[PDB]
Structure formats: structure tokens, C-alpha cells
Design a binder for this molecule. Sequence first.
Ligand code: A3P
Ligand code: A3P
Ligand code: OXR
Ligand code: OXR
Ligand code: CA
Ligand code: CA
Ligand code: HG
Ligand code: HG
Lengths: 342, 342
Amino acid sequence: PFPYEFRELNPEEDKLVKANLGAFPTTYVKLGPKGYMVYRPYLKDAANIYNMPLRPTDVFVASYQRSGTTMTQELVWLIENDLNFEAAKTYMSLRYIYLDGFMIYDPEKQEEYNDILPNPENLDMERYLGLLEYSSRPGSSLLAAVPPTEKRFVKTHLPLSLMPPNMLDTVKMVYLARDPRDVAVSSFHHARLLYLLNKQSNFKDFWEMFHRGLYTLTPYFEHVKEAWAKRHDPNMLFLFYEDYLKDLPGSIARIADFLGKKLSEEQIQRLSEHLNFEKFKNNGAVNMEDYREIGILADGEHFIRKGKAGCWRDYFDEEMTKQAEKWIKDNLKDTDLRYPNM
Amino acid sequence: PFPYEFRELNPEEDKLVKANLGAFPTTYVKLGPKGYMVYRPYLKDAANIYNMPLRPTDVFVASYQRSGTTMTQELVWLIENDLNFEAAKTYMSLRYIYLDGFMIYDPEKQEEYNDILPNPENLDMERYLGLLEYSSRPGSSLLAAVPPTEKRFVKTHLPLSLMPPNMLDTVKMVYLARDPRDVAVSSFHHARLLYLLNKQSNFKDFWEMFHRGLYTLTPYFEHVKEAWAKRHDPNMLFLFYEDYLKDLPGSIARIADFLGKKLSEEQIQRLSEHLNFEKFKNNGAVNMEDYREIGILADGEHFIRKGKAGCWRDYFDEEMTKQAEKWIKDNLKDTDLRYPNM
Ligand SMILES: Nc1ncnc2c1ncn2[C@@H]1O[C@H](COP(=O)(O)O)[C@@H](OP(=O)(O)O)[C@H]1O
Ligand SMILES: Nc1ncnc2c1ncn2[C@@H]1O[C@H](COP(=O)(O)O)[C@@H](OP(=O)(O)O)[C@H]1O
Ligand SMILES: CC1=C(/C=C/C(C)=C/C=C/C(C)=C/CO)C(C)(C)CCC1=O
Ligand SMILES: CC1=C(/C=C/C(C)=C/C=C/C(C)=C/CO)C(C)(C)CCC1=O
Ligand SMILES: [Ca+2]
Ligand SMILES: [Ca+2]
Ligand SMILES: [Hg+2]
Ligand SMILES: [Hg+2]
């Protein structure tokens, strides 16, 4: 009973997209009345995700990407698992199901994906083919494969409107937002990390695409505003990335309270030390460096990258800065939505 | 020591021009005893252009407009640059100096030019002002600014009589001629393209003006006859547009030999494929679509349009057709100038 249509990109939209992602085989469509950008393969599973059976022990960590998902995942996993740090040494990608991870790969275009790499011959092919096959599996079927006697930890960048309405009746969700200018920067570098972008494009080209609602799972503010509207719900915790930076212990204590777990001061500090940036970036369980072994990550880029707020000012000229200002102001008019650092 | 005088259009001439181009702020004068139609700002540089210092490595591509100039510029530039296709990816407007480009713009009438656009609010104003400023720079001074250690590639629609006499003692020139009926049609669509025409004017009105010597840089036949009289000079290569369509490889071979290169069959075929109409129309380095981004090109027109010979028959009624026959006949009488397809 899926209520949304999709439409093709128009010429002006295709041109902005091509200038950033013209080589990349997976194309986009706009989904529903907000025109959320999904990679085409998402459509085959869209109705299944909209009707996915949920369970009372499910926990979700949701965000527009590059907004503090990985940090939160670790925190929530450890807190739910009685601070069992040993058990958390397993890869994050085996500990959470990535609901919408599949959509980026179209199995119909298998050949085209490794033309994107500068050194295809140096791939560990067994792990690469293993990765392609895993990514062929729709997220809904991944979710459903977990036995009911195992707590399901779910990661998604999908907006609330593409999942079951009233899912929060059943499941708990922690949602992260972050200043979109820093989101834009981090998303630029993350696209470079996975070879999504043309080498000839620059960050301003990325910005143009991002703030106009033409990158993956934007419009950005619509995505945030959907969660913001449900923040009052006892089963939603809306956090800001920037509060992790200002007050990590305070943020952890909020998450623990939200999830029903009492923690001592000593346990919060240990959790906080564990999320120290330099330590976490060196953590093979969460830093995605296992994928570099496979040969699909680009030189220079890292999945855990800098860990700062406000460094967008390094990338924005005076023109882009005024474009960001106008865009943010228009989108915060007639709402109580405010960002902590802004 | 400029030997020519100019006159204003008489009332009868003025009525006809004003009927087609009156909205356009830049007006015409007739220059010299043949009465070449020049936009008025030409006069401030006419003497400098008549006396421009020339250099033995200069190459000129000259024509009455819409006669195969752009294709020729590309072939000439690649042959001289050892078929370095990569370096040819820069805009043609940065690789050639347009000698007479400036004359279309009168800096005194700055304010009046954007008023001709249906949507002046959507100009990229930085790029639009940069274009105005560059067009204020007289052609001669642009040529003189190129250092002597860089080869000067020059594009012009000027007749030989307006440039230094005996220029062919020093420089090489490729001149293109084309069936004037097709030149007319192309010229009408190009006028539309840059918003030169009154939208209430039709092609017949354009033809009236064109074949009577009252459009830009006509009289048509006088222009062509000047170049044709020089076609046995070792530094003039006179080509017909129609020969590009019939035998593109043969034309390329004539150009390469003229420029002092001995190309192989394989190289000529590569240049030929590069000049395939559809590829070339979609070649952003030469199709002028960069100006559409500025906001100064009319919807439904393109600088690279159809690329056919003989399609003037779709624009000419039976009377215009005989008027064209009489005009060509009168002008080809007592000369050996003949066109391939005629
Ligand atoms: N422990 C930590 N402390 C601070 N920032 C962290 C972190 N772990 C990851 N990050 C950051 O969070 C951003 C990615 O979030 P997500 O997990 O949703 O993809 C990246 O931001 P930057 O690119 O600005 O460095 C990254 O460096
Ligand atoms: N590669 C190509 N092959 C054939 N015609 C071309 C071409 N590139 C440009 N043209 C054409 O040459 C004409 C313009 O010449 P110029 O470069 O001197 O302005 C236009 O003619 P049409 O309007 O009949 O299509 C255009 O379509
Ligand atoms: C980029 C890329 C691939 C995979 C990309 C993946 C798994 C990206 C995951 C990104 C994440 C987890 C971002 C943070 O949420 C394939 C392995 C599917 C194949 C080819 C490719 O280019
Ligand atoms: C038409 C026009 C302008 C410019 C026109 C140009 C650069 C035209 C070039 C035409 C060519 C290359 C014709 C064939 O060689 C300005 C940008 C100078 C300003 C106003 C205007 O109407
Ligand atoms: Ca391949
Ligand atoms: Ca004006
Ligand atoms: Hg900073
Ligand atoms: Hg034709």
C-alpha cells in the first residue's frame, strides 16, 4: 500500500547532478511529494520498507548522513549491551543492519562499478564480490533475517516518511542532526572516499548540488524537520552532533536515560574516553579501514576524518556563505528548529 | 592612413534595417566604396585593424559568417597543435581571437542591451559584465597582447579590403564560402539566437535585407569575390562549406597540406570523426552553450544548428526563389566563381 510516486530528474537537475556524479553508474529519482533523492535500486524495496514488521526491542539510529551516526551507534550498542567492550570489538557493520545501504548498488551495472577504481587489478576479488552480493540484498530482507531472540540494532539515513508511520509506537529511535554546512563538507569527502565524484568537480559544485536538494536523501531540512516534529515522543531522542563536542558525558547520560539504563559516573567517563576522536578513528571495529584492504576506498580520505564543528568556513567563499545564510534562514522561518552552535 | 570613408544609411535603406534590427541598440554605417555594413563601433578600430602588425606564424580563419568558420577553427587548431585533442578541450573563444567581435557592442549604450532579453533578472551578472568588458576591448589590441612566443589564431568575418593590403605576404588564411541562400537561413536563426531580430520579423524580411546588402558585413558577393581573387596565392586556402559535407577527409587533407603538415590516412579519419556533426554540436568546447548559462541565448536556437546544405528550399517561396536565382546569376556573371552544389 505504498502511497508515493517517483519522478525523473528534469534537465537543470540532471546537469547539476552529472557535474558531480556523472560517471557513477547508480542514478537518482525523486520520491514522494518532498522529492527525496534515492538511488534507483531503492524502488524495488521501497514498499517493503514502508511495511516492514517491527518489534518492541528494535532500536534505530537515524540521521541525514555525516551527522554523528557512527558515534551514536557505538554508544547505543554498548549501553544496551551492559558496557561489554570486548563484544563491541566486532565490526559495526555486523552489529547493525544498514537498512538503506543496498540502494547505492544496481546489480544490473556490476561491470560499471569497478571501472570507477584507478587500480581494479589490486582488488581482493573474493571480498569485493562478497561485498557486491551482500549489497544486492534489500534492506528489508536483512532486517527480517535476524531471529526474534536477537535484539535488532538498525542504522538508516531514510526519512521518517519512508518508514512505517507510527513506527515509534513499537521501536526506539535516536536521531542525529548537524549544521548542514559541516554536513555538506563531510558528505563531499565521504563521496570522494567511495569514488562517487568526478575528480574534476570541486566542493562548490558539491555544495550547489547539496543545498538545492539534489544529493542522496535530501532535501536536507525536510529530513530533519520530520524527526524534529516527533521529538516529543517518548520513543524518540533528537540529538545534535555539536552537543557531542560540547558535552560528551551529558549526551551519553541522556542516551542511557532514554534507553532505560542507569549508568554510574565511572561508566559514562569510560564511555566518553572510548569515543575520544583519535582513539575512535584508530578503532578498526568502527573506522571502516577493513574496506581499504578490499581496495575500494580512495587515498587521502577516511571515514572518521576530523571531528570538528565550524570548519565549513574553510571551504565557503563569501558567495556560498550568503547562499548558506539565506537557505538556513528560509528553512528556519515559521519553526522552533534551532541549531546549538548557530 | 585609412583610405575609406563611411556614410549613414539613406531613408530607404534605414526603413528596411529598422524593420528587422531596430530594437537592437547598435546601429550600422556603410564603410568604403563597396558599402560593407559595419556596426558603428567598428570605426574606432578600423584604422588600427587596417594597419595591424602581423607575424609570420599568424593563421586567420575568415568567412562571411555562418559559412563553416567554427569547424574550420577546430581543424586548423588541432593540425597546428599536433592533434593534441586534450588541449583542444578549452573553449574556442580562448583559443582564437575574434578580430571583429567587438563591434557589436557600444559601451555608450550599456544600459540598453539587457532590455532586449525576456528575463534580464536571470543574468549571471558577473559573467555578463565580464563579457561586456571583454567586448569593449578593440580587436587590434587583443591581437597585439598575445606574446610573440605564442601562435596567434585569428577568427574574422572582415573582408580582405578592411585588413592590411598584402597581409597574405605574411600570414596564412583559410577562407570559407557557402551557398548564400543557406548562409541567409543560418544567419536569420543566429540573429534570433543573440536576440538581434525583432520577434515580429520573419525570414523573408531577413532575406530582403540580406540579399540587398544591408545585413552585417554584406554585400555578400563582394566579400567572397575578394577572397576568391586571392585563391592561387600560396597563403590563401579558399574552401566551400559544401565540400565539408561531400568529402570531409579531402578537405582536411587540403587544410593540413596548406599548413605544412603531412598527415596519414589514420590521422585524417580521426579529425573527421571529431567533426561529426552530432558529436561537435554536443562539444561544449565549441557549441557556445556556455553563454546560455550567462542568460543571453534565445530558447530554441543553437550556435551549432542542423549542418545541411540545400535546406534553404524549406524557407523560400517561389518568388523569393527566383529573386535569389536572379541575384546569384547577376553576381556570377563574368566571373569564374562557382559553388559545388549549385
Ligand atoms: N568519536 C567521534 N568524535 C567526533 N566526531 C566523530 C567521531 N566519530 C566520527 N565522527 C565524525 O562524524 C562525522 C560522520 O558522521 P556519520 O557517522 O553519521 O557518517 C564525521 O565528521 P567530519 O567529516 O566533519 O570529520 C566524523 O569525523
Ligand atoms: N561539424 C559540423 N558539420 C556540419 N556543419 C557544422 C558543424 N559545425 C557547425 N556547423 C554549421 O555551420 C554553420 C555555422 O558556421 P559558422 O561556424 O561560420 O558560424 C551552422 O550551419 P546551419 O545553421 O545551416 O546548421 C552550423 O550548424
Ligand atoms: C561505493 C561502492 C560500493 C559500496 C559502498 C558502501 C557499502 C558504502 C557505505 C557507506 C556508508 C556505510 C556510509 C555511512 O552511513 C560497492 C562495494 C557496492 C561497489 C562499488 C562502489 O563504488
Ligand atoms: C549579443 C550581445 C553580446 C555579445 C555577443 C557575442 C559575443 C556574439 C558572438 C557571436 C559570434 C561568435 C558570431 C559568429 O562568429 C554582448 C554580450 C556584447 C552584450 C549584449 C548583446 O546583445
Ligand atoms: Ca568492469
Ligand atoms: Ca537595462
Ligand atoms: Hg573549525
Ligand atoms: Hg536539405
